[model samples]
Target chain A: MRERIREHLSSEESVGLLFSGCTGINDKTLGARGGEVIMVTSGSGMGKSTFVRQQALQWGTAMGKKVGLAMLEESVEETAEDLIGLHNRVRLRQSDSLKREIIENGKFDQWFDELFGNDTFHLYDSFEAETDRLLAKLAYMRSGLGCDVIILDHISIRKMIDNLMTKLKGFAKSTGVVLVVICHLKSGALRQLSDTIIALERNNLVLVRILKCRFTGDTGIAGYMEYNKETGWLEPSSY
Target chain B: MRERIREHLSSEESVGLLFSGCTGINDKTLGARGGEVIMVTSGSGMGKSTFVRQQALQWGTAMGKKVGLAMLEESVEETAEDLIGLHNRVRLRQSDSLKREIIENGKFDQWFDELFGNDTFHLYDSFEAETDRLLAKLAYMRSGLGCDVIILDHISIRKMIDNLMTKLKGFAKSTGVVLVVICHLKSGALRQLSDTIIALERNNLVLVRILKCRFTGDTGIAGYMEYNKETGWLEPSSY
Candidate 1:
């Protein structure tokens, strides 16, 4: 039954995509590596989507890696605008006045062009995506668009979500593109197939936990982050 | 918490891809429908793969609909050769003599052009296909290739097979494509999510059982077929 397991294991080490959001968490998890699936889960309304998007922004803008975003729970326009606000350090979705201000002053297009003008980001804009179709689009993102990293802002139940992770395991491994899957606390294949899992907790304050890391062997509350309402960014907290 | 559950169920009915082999079973299950999943399972060497491929041949050639084949268990050339031989009612995989004779006599190109030259058959040729990647390619076959039917000759264990069908449920329903999955007896979601389940048993002889059909209520041995050693085709038997 065995040919050569030793031969299959290679000496060449793999370099992972470095996280630019929170330093301690990034260092502990060693960032999301290519051919790996990272799971991020948080309670409802705990800013899990926002937290993951921030990572996407960091990877695309800071690390200069081309990224793909599959916003399955929201529209394409919503994500594009969120990034605009995110890049400019202002909340566009929350403020109609700020959206008006940006459009009038030409900051909207300016921010849009600054982030999206280059070949840094791509979007799969659909509210409801079937598991297979989502994978299909993601497969193309790596093969067709040359995206180094992809973020999936997901939505579904537990058993159904298990279906997602089970499938993503192979897609991530074979394609060698870093995958960050955003699943909520209510939903959770994740522990087994997932190479790294990042959990967010919000009781009195938001705390980022490095739940598990297959590579680094580190697990703990990496640190906390203070959510800046006006800026719409998760800032590193001193506490 | 609720808006309108009734509104989600529509009056617009869906039509299915009918099976050409084993008429009673086809009529019983009413064929594989648009937006549906059909699972074919059997013991090893029971002719399940050949039977399923015959269904694919019937759907593409006889029905004249665009079909996609994802043969995870075999190579692209192997499936193409099988279909080529199956079309002319001969077994090419077993006959080096027949293959050489066909190519030497110019019958190879004649049959290849007759089937493949048209837009009827499309293949996703990979021996080892991950679950999501399989779905992605199949989804494209429907949307990108305009294939009305897709046959996935799958390879996996029981839990993993469950993972495949669980994800395929939504892909079929949303995209309205016919998905026929081939799973071995050692592997068997299949019952709950699958629209129809056809199980093949080979004790003393080969038998086809309509184990479960969500569409048609009929259940039991649909019929049996005799495997022709020369043709490599499952022929309808008197038994």
Candidate 2:
């Protein structure tokens, strides 16, 4: 105990910033270190998927951290279009004329280089056969692929909510990686087990609220994260 | 455009305070002016019912505004007990000894006096039979009973979510009374139709997030509201 206290006091362990790119205007800077399970919940059409995608992109591409995504609903091709659209700030694969021009003009390299160039990012969009298999794939992503951040798109099956969340919590603790889980609005038990619970809602502007945070033991509105339709990016607003 | 601006500038209207007793602590004071519809959504056990009850009590008793309640779930007696429990800041009917003492020593007067003392506070807990009949009763409460604020415990049917919301919005505009509606977390259309959408979530602390606000056009976390389990009252935290 004395040795552990001395090590904690003398030096420091680095924590990853959740809102790293969002500076100057963001008042609520929520940081998620390793071994933390963060749950984000919302109703449909509330931008739950988009927000998680942005997190994976930021952590993987900009910060040079390994990111593993478990896509449950959308197909790989559909999600790939969303990724490229967000990256180029334009609706990709919409206009055949523009697509041909991009390919002929050698602008496709920019998109490919940003998204697929880094080998640290991985996706698990295929059917996992069972819950244990899904957990094993995430474990493989963490240990085999050396990913520090794992994002699961959502928990769709109502019956499996509690069971899956318990296993996810255990995996997050034992592996010491940040696990971001998107959930439907029905699970109160899952909210109780998470280290942080973020609820998202959208009207004209997208609203993100930090419902629970274990690190600081504080709860409040994180900030107004507005989505730019033109840029396909969400910008944090001043509180 | 010039005519609309001129009429808007010369208009006179009154709004009710959202958090009546939380005077100095609440910086983001959202006022539900007459002729506006506010929607509150939350998962089960997140204190949606309690928060609305507090609003009804504060507006009716503290501000001397006439308030009406249309409870769809619980019986009148059970709802009354909840109201009194919140008012007294204690569980009133739980202990047999305390119940006997209150009845014998005339301490029951305190409960009755606060809740039923004013004729302004009315409750329509009976079965409505139909949606039109329910709307008629609410209209009567506004004009005949002179209620300035009306609260519906919840939208009873899932299919009626959007249709009822449209009618309620029209009624609020026509009758010029603050209409507060409690809803489930599954309705995305409700979030869009409401002038202000406040979402509540709880683990240990109750979090209030403003999903949408037309007056300010800003969205974010409102603040933390801690619930006193015994009293059933939610106290707002200082921002």
Candidate 3:
């Protein structure tokens, strides 16, 4: 134990992906570290996916990390569109006519190439929900695709869900890949499995709450953010 | 009650969205009708999502019915690609180089326009998991978008999953839209809520089993189909 402590003290801890837009959470938790599991939750339409995507964008583009998106709920086109729109400050998916115009005018191809060109984003192509298969694909994303961080946008709660949660933690630890999981409500098991837990509440006057942070021992309201319709982004708010 | 019985007999029962390729399941259940919830399940990697997507493609392009896909697991790009690939007999996603070549050479636009330009496919753009919000969106898809059929490619089993199931059934009944839900295993509550249930097992000679059918009172092995790698489709198998 003394040898372990001495070894641990010999090196400085490596930093993880930093928050792109939300400063308050960044200041509090110090960012999501590699080998750590970050759990995100929110009320319905409260910008949970939005919050994480911005962070992913920052990590992949700004920080130059290989990021994998395993969005079990939505399609790759939607994900691609969201990222492009967010970057360009345009909600392209909302207006079909506008989207058509963009595609026809060659702007869509330009944006799509600009965002996805460098191979920074690795999107999981299939949406099958079997657990073992999910884990295998995630492993491939980390090792085979060389992803430093992987986002599993929500998990299906199932029989033996606890077992799966524990397995996810183990995967994060053993592989040394940062795992960000989007989830619905849960307290005990989730709290235990995750190194950090961030929950969102929106009336859009969205409230960002850091429910648990193992590194900082911080828990409570992180700050406020408002949902921007035009950009489809969550911008930091005053109240 | 007498009026209800007489009216039911008067129309000789309305047919629903029939299986596009799978003749066996269609022969048994007749088809998924309006105002009915059909549950689809399978072991991981067994043609669950593929089976449904084929049906969705058939309903939209072939049948000329407005089909809304609320796939909670994958992104719209993946869904769109899958449909286009299936229709054009090319697995576009597996080879990124090929995908890029296709895009650069103008083949992608041609295929994308061919498959998606009709506005028949309504894909839910955001990947939020809140139940009430999900229900509301589904309602809009039915009434606002005039979707004759909607495929909810999954449901996240949550704290009040049973309640969600009940609500889904209610939503189907009230809206009179064909709601095909992809789900994992659970017997009583699921069987009760769903009008019909189909399960799949794959050794790539995939086995299709009908777990329940309320309209026909028929349940058991539907047939078999092999997952086609070349086109990303499921083909009928002898076994």
Candidate 4:
């Protein structure tokens, strides 16, 4: 026990952040750390996907970190277009004029070009059907593609997925990479595996609560954010 | 629809206070309100019983309102002893000297005399085994005993209790009585029946979040409280 304590005290490990720009969240959380599996939970239709996408954008575009996104629910083209539209503040392919503007102007051109330009950002389009395959691809992204952060849009709380979750926790700790996953609030067993758990509730105000944090004691009502539907951006509040 | 809106607008219904002395909770919630079934949810061993008992004491002693407490978990003798101990700030029946100090000094004596003397506080000792009997007793407390506020110390989310919850809501609505019930955090079905839902979390600090409110839109991070374990009191925080 003494040796274990001494070893733990002597060892030095650095924490990498998943959220850096959102002061409301980052300051309170000390930012989401690498080698930690974080669960972002909410009820259905509460903008879980949008928040994860924004994080992906933040890491890839702003911080110049390698980010991999596994889009299980939508097509790669649609996800790409949505991210571009979020940045451009216009609905993609909704109106002919808007579509032409995206085509004619270099705005949409630059967004997708930059997204795919570097080996920095990667998208796993076909790994949604199987947990094993998804885990394999994530490993590949970290090892082969040099991705430091991987965001899995969702992992349903099925018996098979629950079995994989134990392995996922080990993978996250061993790889020393940030693993952000979306799951339902009712997914009790899956949530228990996470190092940090973020619960989102939306009524009149968008509320974010850090339900659990393994590293730090800072938890509960980290902050609030307002979603701009047209711009697809979550503007952080003073709260 | 127009007539309904006009009738709602013109209604002169009064709201009662569950959190009587805690201005942080009362001011934000506009009090717990009459004719409303409130669900107070928390994890195991997080002072759900103490919080609800404080509410009962506040209503009965502070507001001079009739209050009823139906403790499902413990015997009437044990509950009574606990309440006395809480008031006296000492363990009941643990020492003769302390008991004598309470009685001779008119401390515990006055607490119980006041509790039972006014006919404003009632306890249903025989309502745990049967759901129908419990509902009937609650009705009796409201009509026969003249209780304006009733606290049920945890009704399990079984089918029988779920069935009776609908009737309890109707009873509150028809009689304009405040009904507060304790439940587990995972009781989704039971929580859905409440007009206002308070979710509590405890770590180093006790956190309260208003998960839902049907009558008003105020929700999320209602406030924080510190539990004095020795005195069995929840001291509200500025937060």
Candidate 3: regions farther than 4 A off: A1-10, A156-159, A186-188, B1-239
Q: TM-score: which is higher, 1 or 3?
A: 3
DockQ of each: 0.01, 0.01, 0.02, 0.01
Interface RMSD of 4: 22.3
lDDT of 4 by residue, B1-239 (tens): 99989998898554457584244566457777889998888865566776787777777777889888877776465566555555556545333345555545756556676566668777766553676777888888899988889888876556676677888788888998899988855454566678888877876457877888877777787778876534557787766
Ranking 2 against 3 by TM-score, winner: 3
Q: Give the alpha-carbon lDDT of every model.
A: 0.77, 0.72, 0.78, 0.71
Query: What is the full ranking by TM-score, best candidate first?
Result: 3, 4, 2, 1
Better of 1 and 3 by lDDT: 3
Candidate 3 residue lDDT tens string, A151-182: 99876444456776788899999999999998
* Candidate 2 C-alpha lDDT tens digits along B1-239: 12322232223232245564333213332477688888888887677888888888888888889988888877778778777776777776676777678777886787778678879578889855477777888899999999999988887434566667778888999998989888776464576667777788776467777777654344667678777666666776664
DockQ of 2: 0.01
- Isolated chain B TM-score per model: 0.89, 0.87, 0.91, 0.85
| Model 3 B-chain TM | 0.91
For model 1 chain B, the run of ten residues with the poorest summed lDDT: B1-10
Docking class of 1: incorrect
TM-scores, each model vs. reference = 0.48, 0.49, 0.52, 0.49
Question: What tens digits encode model 1's per-residue C-alpha lDDT throughout A121-182?
Answer: 99887635478888899899999999999888885445656787888889999988999888
TM-score of 3: 0.52
lDDT (Cα, tens digit) per residue for candidate 3, span B106-178: 9989988888898798988565657898888999999999999988987533446777788889999998899
